[PDB]
Amino acid sequence: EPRTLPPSPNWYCARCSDAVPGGLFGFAARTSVFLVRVGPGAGESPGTPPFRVIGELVGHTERVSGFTFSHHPGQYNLCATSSDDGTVKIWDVETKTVVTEHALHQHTISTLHWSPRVKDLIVSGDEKGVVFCYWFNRNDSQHLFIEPRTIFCLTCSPHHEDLVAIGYKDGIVVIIDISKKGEVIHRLRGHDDEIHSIAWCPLPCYLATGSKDQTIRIWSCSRGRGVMILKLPFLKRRVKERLWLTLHWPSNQPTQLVSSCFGGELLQWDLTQSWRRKYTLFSASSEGQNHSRIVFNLCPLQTEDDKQLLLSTSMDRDVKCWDIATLECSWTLPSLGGFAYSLAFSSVDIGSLAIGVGDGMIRVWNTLSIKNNYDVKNFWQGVKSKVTALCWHPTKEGCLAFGTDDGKVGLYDTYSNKPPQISSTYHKKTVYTLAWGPPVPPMSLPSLALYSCGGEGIVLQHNPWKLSGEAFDINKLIRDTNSIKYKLPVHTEISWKADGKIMALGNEDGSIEIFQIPNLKLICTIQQHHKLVNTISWHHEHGSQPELSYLMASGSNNAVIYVHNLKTVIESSPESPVTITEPYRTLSGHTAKITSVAWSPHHDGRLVSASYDGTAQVWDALREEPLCNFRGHRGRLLCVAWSPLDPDCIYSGADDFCVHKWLTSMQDHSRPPQ
Ligand SMILES: C[n+]1cn([C@@H]2O[C@H](COP(=O)(O)OP(=O)(O)O)[C@@H](O)[C@H]2O)c2nc(N)[nH]c(=O)c21
């Protein structure tokens, strides 16, 4: 399996993640459940954090709203999910397949719980207050209804196999007996708002409830009354955001109770110090290890080497693992909240990978961290909208160019906390391409200019030193230099040659026009593609044969990839432009549009391509031979990038909300699926 940057855990679900001893962690994300092996079984270096994304539960067609592991010894491999598609599925995580399922619910399911006491019991509840009890082994059921209120959470008793606690949207908490046709045994009034979490005392009774009303309440089953009220402290920061108050009652420390707080802070409440309402802040000493937005779920995981771990899911899109013994953050697994549109490695900071995501946050992945496989920085300043284009500055470290789907073009400094400069001139459509190169008139009359291409077909030339100034339409220069009466084509791609002496423009009609410095004289037009040009890449200038740097790969809405050698036509320097209609090489194999191509900086004529067919293909372009096909993604690939340091390592991003880091040598398939 490849190293994976997963989709964000789902929000506002009382229980859409869970863990089992060993062990294995699973979290709902969009329509799937992603499994994470944690501990010795993850197979990681003694330095790097002991975890790894190993699998995915695929089958649901709508949002997964609930997830629960079977905590019965021997059946830690069984789990259950709930979905907005109306179904409850039982899974086998070792085969990622569905054992059995049901669709008994007639309304949108809220959550579900695997009974801690009965091997095959799974209780679920929907937003009309309907509860189904499901025994999957003998395929039995029990339609129940308690109160005409929206169910938010439910938790089976770990001690009594017939007791189930249910929390509602209005603050009502009930404990029912499922053997007595769902009779309300206790009715707990006190909360004024949504119940988010319900935890029973691990010792055989007491139970704790967490609510949006900022209070935690401990109740006694004997008296059916509340014995303790814990209100959240108004702590200091370390934006209108509502609270989510979830709980964990550690079986090791029955006198302690873990909860979330404002801003995603985690708290450990000492219940013996009742009147003192004494708590301890998680990672109280260290800064920046804590979540920055609210926490939704908490899952206890004891590893095989007896480590007490706690996993948290958050709105800040991080998944964190805490050591309960120290209350410190062991590690962090970042996640994506949208499409992975662009990938770009810096030529200055060689291992620095920038990721353009559809949730309005730029990720910078330090792929060279020895102690951390997921060293990822977030940048949300002045972005908001989807980042659809990225390009590092070629010489200035920490300077990143970015473009958004609403036509914005910006300059972000990642070494500092300076707000990004936003260009005044913007495109009427999505910025699909950015490129650095030598400034052309009128700008040249800065060392490098930032070029941006938008969906409307305009390519703007930006000034780095004066971003708020006026960006120039290069069509105004092309029209004059090459003397063109009729209108110019819709540009869809821009790619500079390595020497900065040649700029290539791809168009909606499928043609690629070849211009040259300093006035963009049209010396060549490639008529090969008959559909919109998506991507163009020039070969690097440090191959065995320096004549390789005249090779140009291109991808369009057709599945066929073309390579064109431009040694002759460029070195001939024709005053009359030349039309080329023959490919120097041809790469067939993909079955859908090509979104991205890139040359390996480690080899000669080795190309990687990203396609809507759901795969990435590695070619030996010179011999037109497919080498390996990566099929890890479940969606359509939007971008691909070669590791600058490892010749065997490639990164890819798709609309499945995933970035995969994979090895060419580990791929069994050689060509795309047919
Ligand atoms: C219009 N357009 C679409 N793409 C590619 O196609 C993806 C999305 O294309 P889309 O038109 O936004 O939606 P659709 O193709 O699924 O119907 C983007 O992530 C790009 O990789 C494009 N890529 C480039 N370079 N230029 C373009 O004008 C362009």
Instruction: Domain ranges for the chain, please list them.
Output: 1-329, 330-674
The alpha carbon of residue 224 and the mean position of all alpha carbons in its chain are separated, in whole angstroms, by: 44
Residues 134/92, Cβ–Cβ less than 8 Å: no
Starting at the earlier edge strand, list the strands of the sheet with 637-642. Answer: 3-5, 659-663, 649-654, 637-642
The DSSP secondary structure of 2-58, one letter per residue, reads: -EEEPBPPPSS-TTSEEEETBTEEEEEETTEEEEEEESGGG---SSS-SEEEEEEE-
Rounded to the nearest angstrom, the distance between the alpha carbon of 20 and the centre of ligand 1 is 41
For residues 412 and 393, give the distance between their C-alpha atoms in angstroms, rounded to a whole number. Answer: 10
For residues 639 and 659, give the distance between their C-alpha atoms in angstroms, rounded to a whole number. Answer: 9
Task: Tell me whether domains 1-329 and 330-674 share a fold.
Answer: yes
> What H or E segment, with its residue span, contains residue 206?
strand 206-211
Q: Does ligand 1 come within 6 angstroms of the Cβ of 339?
A: no
Please state, as a whole number, how many other Cβ atoms lie within 10 Å of the Cβ of residue 424. 13
Tokens of 7: 């989709």
For residues 252 and 259, give the distance between their C-alpha atoms in angstroms, rounded to a whole number. Answer: 16
Q: What ligand 1 atom has the least distance to the C-alpha of 433?
A: 25
Residue 323, classed as helix, strand or coil, is strand
**Cα atoms in the Cβ-side hemisphere of radius 13 Å centred on 487:** 5
Amino acid at position 29, single letter = A
For residues 600 and 588, give the distance between their C-alpha atoms in angstroms, rounded to a whole number. Answer: 19
Rounded to the nearest angstrom, the distance between the alpha carbon of 618 and the centre of ligand 1 is 22
Cβ neighbors of 568 (< 8 A, separation 6 or more) are none
For residues 614 and 438, give the distance between their C-alpha atoms in angstroms, rounded to a whole number. Answer: 36
CATH number 3.40.220.10 given to 1-329: no
Distances (CA, A) of 144 to 13, 113, 613, 618: 21, 15, 45, 56
Residue whose CA lies nearest to ligand 1 atom number 1? 455
The distance in angstroms from the start CA to the end CA of the chain is: 23
- Mutation to probe ligand 1, out of 532, 596, 637, 657 (largest number of atoms < 8 A from CB): 532
Resolution of the experimental structure, in angstroms: 2.5
Angle at 409 between CA 405 and CA 413, to 5 degrees: 120
Q: Does ligand 1 come within 6 angstroms of the Cβ of 556?
A: no
For residues 460 and 412, give the distance between their C-alpha atoms in angstroms, rounded to a whole number. Answer: 18
Please state the φ and ψ torsions of residue 449, each to the nearest 5 degrees: -115, 145
The CATH fold of domain 330-674: Methylamine Dehydrogenase; Chain H (2.130.10)
Closest CA to 119 of 98, 145, 140: 140
Residue whose CA lies nearest to ligand 1 atom number 6? 595
Residues 331/49, Cβ–Cβ less than 8 Å: yes
Please state the φ and ψ torsions of residue 256, each to the nearest 5 degrees: -120, 150
Please state whether beta strands 578-580 and 521-527 pair in parallel, antiparallel, or not at all (unpaired).
parallel
Method: X-ray
Rounded to the nearest angstrom, the distance between the alpha carbon of 534 and the centre of ligand 1 is 7
- Mutation to probe ligand 1, out of 391, 431, 432 (largest number of atoms < 8 A from CB): 432
Q: Does ligand 1 come within 6 angstroms of the Cβ of 493?
A: yes
At which residue do the structure tokens 């900065």 appear?
500
Residue 647 backbone class (left: φ over 0; alpha: ψ -120 to 50; beta: rest): alpha
Q: Does ligand 1 come within 6 angstroms of the Cβ of 433?
A: yes
Q: Does ligand 1 come within 6 angstroms of the Cβ of 246?
A: no
Q: Does ligand 1 come within 6 angstroms of the Cβ of 534?
A: yes
At which residue do the structure tokens 């991507």 appear?
535
